[PDB]
Design a protein around this ligand. Structure first.
Ligand SMILES: Cc1cc2nc3c(=O)[nH]c(=O)nc-3n(C[C@H](O)[C@H](O)[C@H](O)COP(=O)(O)OP(=O)(O)OC[C@H]3O[C@@H](n4cnc5c(N)ncnc54)[C@H](O)[C@@H]3O)c2cc1C
Ligand SMILES: Cc1cc2nc3c(=O)[nH]c(=O)nc-3n(C[C@H](O)[C@H](O)[C@H](O)COP(=O)(O)OP(=O)(O)OC[C@H]3O[C@@H](n4cnc5c(N)ncnc54)[C@H](O)[C@@H]3O)c2cc1C
Ligand SMILES: Nc1ncnc2c1ncn2[C@@H]1O[C@H](COP(=O)(O)OP(=O)(O)O)[C@@H](O)[C@H]1OP(=O)(O)O
Ligand SMILES: [Au+]
Ligand code: NA
Lengths: 577, 577
């Protein structure tokens, strides 16, 4: 019998051209002939049948005989003849400046860059941030470091520390009385200082590890040619055997009068030179709610305008609960969608501007136009791939209707030497640790010939709302939609974190956890959901249960740590219905 | 035929004989019960189920007798019961199905679970007062003088460090030293304890459990004599007894120890600020307390004579000592040779103790004294079971007062059981007592074969910087498997909540993962030093119920930004530092 996957995938990495076959199917001469044209030897592997099904499953091609070129799977002869007919194959076989060109200095980009060079490969990293419509820009690290997870969590923590001052008093700390205010200017500088240290850290790390970095915006001008333009306007050509597109997304604006003129975004909020003041958040996304949250927590009057539901994609039971709590915490929610934004005042520094927001509200006997004045309006409806000016048409990299790249796993489904990871990969969950993992693993497949795949199912999340929401697996609905109400047990409880027991927090009547189980398969766990302080820290480890098809019986036989919130998952007995 | 069927038959039936192949002397048994007008039901076990059944009940050989749902052993054991007159008394009707001695974690758990299975139950709690005369209500050690108050006083200490963080994040707090009022904290705490005490007392009445606030002693084979506070003495009778008395603080045979020093029992209800404080002992209790006492502003000293946290990973213990040292706690290897009272505590002010220590100078060794306001004895906790009359029912004890068990069954007496701290070699933890109680009741009254899982129990020490652990220490692992077969993976990190601060904790957070190299880095233990160690550890502990490998941690996607995600990216190997 033939070879196994292991042997195939390493020989594919080692060898310049590889043909992997099962039976001596015709057209294999036709291959050797094709590469004859280019003075190229063609190595060869007889695979076992025992192994065909797996190998095809990994590389994502349908049928038995496979070509690999400089460690990239092309498909069958059908695919190969297109590359040659197009002239691509001739260009591809030529020596190139870099082993791998990475477009994007984000979570995935930097992860991939570090992992690649660890496997001794010549790598170039291109980061450039086209500025917000208000003209905001930033350093190396991408969305998370500069305008995402990092600043957001720090501003959440600020808002929590506010609620902690009040707790301090109930525990006996004699704090001088008088309203305590939050100075925005201090928080903002505090945050931006850390972002600076990260930016610098990442820039160092690349130099320390021998990775070329260019602060230049890149566009494909040939089959293996990026044209890259820097801040000055200087333009260079870069060449590589492989490309990774790790471009991520940018805040979405709606096609409304005054939107791009009058409203800030995620990109702008974390470096504002003024206290945002009376604030309107437009959108139901996790971003809208998370933000909306902390601004109220640092003392601002906050309003959230939604089109229909909060957190579309998340458990709408859990979403409704967040809304009830955030409501009791003085955030105002409304059904409206603005029809126009009008600027009344420009911000100075040290002072915000004034926006008039136009809505159309409905009574019993009429529909009539309404306005309300806010200091600052945050647009937070979505994030979109900005890939038009990339020249993916030049390399023939297919995109979805959204700007996202359609993959065979991380491989462009059209072009075999161009790959994509993180937010820009069609249907990739838009989370930092996913980009990083997808990057690290891909590099280990390409340059080591391992069969390791990133696990994009059962990913734990946390929404950093005023009272945090942690989740893993299916929602109550999805489970019922899929399996039917008669076959789903939901176990749940309410509870009071001990840290809140001697206080009069509104959070005391809102903490809730629940466990969603397949009744016909020993209460196998499909999902869990918790509303609590430190939801992030609780969820992460319990998420590993779903990598083992854990049953409710496994949760019940686990001994608790007391006193913690987490132990509550150890003692669920009440059934939802 | 199989185990299940045997154990249910045993629950259903008054008298059961289980055999595999009949031996003589089995008539001699049925003849014995004939004397009691008693039917003797009978079961043929299959050979396949023999090995399991013996393993569950913990007896060596084939033939098994069960009496009112309790396993007695073979004929050898049965003739003892009859020769002793115990068998005749046992078969008589009794007032209660189960008498529970102790209103603690296990006692109350057991009582609730028993009555849920529709059984007549009596619960006996009484608190013999501290040497200083302190007493308290229902709920036992955890509720009144353990986990609950301790965690609340820890939380107080943390909120202190949070005020300082609030300022670095931009909260304008009026400047001037902020002091903590002990009297407020103490009343805050004791109010919650009151609500718990009252809650539990109600819950028993709500659920139809008889509660007697009376100290119990065995005066017959099936008779407890119980004395209440007034001095009134009552007789209680039952078919079964659960002993769940737990432990009490240990004092040394040193002049003035009991006179001059307080304990855990006294500390959480002190009418005074403890002031300058000496903690005697290296136990988790000594350190946890020393911790929060320093955190609310007191001058704290810890006297230990040997290692810290004996039983715990001495790497992690050393790390805690350095941190607690940087936080102003003073550690000394002396052991007091006498305590002398200088002042009585009075008028919500503390007293003054003179502590005598033997030190070494250049040419010799000499006596020394130092003055503390308050000395807390944290040597350990011991079983106070002499005045229980376990000698009457012939319940064997270990050299310490703890009850020797066949699992939770007294090894000597088949209708007396023990759980929680007083059960020889039970880990002394609230969730263990509770589980042991809940499960036992389900075994006794349902005939299930479910065992409490006493291996791989997660803990957290609530030191100023929390320590969470599960599984083997790095030492145990090497002792057991040998250095050549143990991988330790580890890393340092900085919780984001601390990034913009000047906290000492920034240079002390550390996690590590202990792995069996020769079995795919199977995980034997993990250890983390961090904020919220309790909440992080709980879920990761379930990994050890599935023999998780390092490869399972690496393929888990993280939640960002959290501390917990650090376990998903360990790459560095400890090389004997
Ligand atoms: C407000 C907010 C909060 C978030 N909070 C969380 C959270 O709590 N947890 C979490 O897991 N995720 C969170 N996310 C999502 C997370 O930040 C992203 O999913 C992640 O950063 C994506 O990484 P990436 O490398 O794929 O893209 P990015 O992080 O966006 O990096 C892409 C980089 O490529 C650069 N680039 C783009 N085009 C070019 C070009 N032509 N040439 C050169 N460089 C180019 C971009 O400017 C950017 O520098 C949050 C996102 C936002 C907006
Ligand atoms: C300071 C401190 C901190 C702790 N922190 C933690 C922690 O953080 N996490 C954790 O998991 N564990 C912790 N523990 C341990 C925990 O308190 C015990 O493990 C747990 O309470 C044991 O419960 P139990 O049911 O075995 O006994 P207990 O809760 O001690 O119940 C025994 C009760 O029975 C009563 N009794 C005794 N004799 C008689 C009699 N003859 N008749 C009637 N009643 C009687 C006693 O007065 C007492 O009320 C801590 C302990 C202490 C002291
Ligand atoms: N007379 C004494 N003086 C000072 N410390 C003491 C003491 N007796 C016990 N301790 C400490 O107080 C702690 C509590 O004792 P313990 O009975 O719980 O020990 P262990 O947990 O090892 O069984 C122990 O760490 C013990 O340290 P040693 O192991 O060095 O004894
Ligand atoms: Au290779
Ligand atoms: Na008890």
């Amino acid at each position: 019998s033939g070879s196994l996957a292991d042997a195939v995938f390493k020989s594919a990495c080692e060898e310049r051209i590889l043909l992997a076959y099962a039976d001596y199917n015709p057209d294999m001469t036709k291959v050797v002939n094709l590469f004859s044209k280019y003075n190229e030897t063609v190595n060869t592997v007889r695979v076992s049948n025992d192994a065909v099904k797996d190998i095809l499953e990994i590389v994502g091609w349908p049928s038995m005989p496979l070509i690999f070129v400089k460690g990239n799977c092309c498909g069958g002869f059908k695919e190969l003849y297109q590359l040659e007919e197009s002239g691509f194959l001739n260009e591809w076989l030529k020596e190139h400046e870099y082993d791998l060109a990475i477009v994007g200095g984000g979570s995935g980009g930097l992860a991939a860059a570090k992992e690649a060079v660890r496997l001794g490969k010549k790598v170039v990293c291109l980061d450039f941030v086209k500025p917000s419509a208000m003209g905001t820009t930033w350093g190396l690290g991408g969305t998370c470091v500069n305008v995402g997870c990092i600043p957001k969590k720090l501003m959440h923590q600020a808002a929590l520390l506010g609620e902690y001052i009040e707790d301090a008093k109930k525990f006996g700390w004699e704090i001088p009385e008088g309203a305590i205010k939050l100075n925005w200017h201090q928080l903002k500088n505090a945050v931006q200082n850390h972002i600076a240290s990260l930016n610098w850290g990442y820039r160092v790390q690349l130099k320390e590890k021998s990775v070329t970095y260019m602060n230049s915006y890149a566009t494909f001008t040939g089959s293996h040619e990026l044209s890259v333009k820097n801040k000055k306007g200087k333009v260079e050509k870069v060449t590589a055997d492989r490309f990774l597109i790790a471009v991520g997304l940018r805040p979405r604006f709606p096609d409304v009068p005054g939107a791009l003129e009058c409203c800030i975004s995620s990109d702008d909020l974390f470096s504002l030179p003024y206290n945002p003041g009376k604030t309107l958040c437009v959108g139901a996304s996790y971003v809208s709610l998370e933000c909306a949250g902390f601004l109220k927590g640092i003392g601002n009057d906050v309003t959230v305008m939604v089109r229909s539901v909060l957190l579309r994609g998340f458990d709408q039971d859990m979403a409704e609960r967040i809304k009830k709590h955030m409501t009791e915490r003085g955030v105002k929610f409304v059904q409206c969608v603005p029809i126009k934004y009008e600027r009344l005042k420009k911000p100075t520094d040290s002072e915000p501007g004034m926006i008039r927001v136009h809505t159309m509200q409905e009574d019993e006997d009429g529909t009539k136009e309404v306005t309300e004045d806010f200091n600052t309006v945050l647009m937070a409806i979505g994030r979109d791939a900005m890939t038009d000016d990339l020249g993916l048409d030049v390399v023939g990299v297919n995109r979805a209707k959204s700007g996202k790249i359609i993959g065979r796993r991380e491989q462009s489904v059209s072009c075999p030497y161009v790959y994509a990871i993180g937010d820009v990969l069609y249907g990739s969950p838009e989370l930092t640790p996913v980009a990083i993992q997808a990057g690290k693993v891909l590099m280990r497949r390409l340059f080591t010939g391992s069969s390791e795949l990133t696990e994009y199912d059962k990913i734990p999340t946390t929404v950093f709302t005023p009272l945090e929401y942690g989740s893993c697996g299916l929602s109550e609905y999805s489970a019922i939609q899929k399996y039917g109400k008669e076959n789903i047990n939901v176990y749940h409880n309410v509870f009071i974190p001990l840290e809140y027991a001697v206080t009069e927090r509104k959070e005391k009547t809102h903490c809730y956890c629940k466990l969603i189980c397949l009744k016909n398969e020993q209460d196998l766990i499909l999902g869990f959901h918790i509303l609590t302080p430190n939801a992030g820290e609780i969820t992460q480890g319990f998420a590993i249960a779903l990598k083992f098809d854990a049953k409710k019986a496994d949760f019940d036989r686990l001994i608790g740590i007391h006193p913690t919130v987490a132990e509550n998952f150890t003692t669920l007995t009440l059934v939802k219905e």
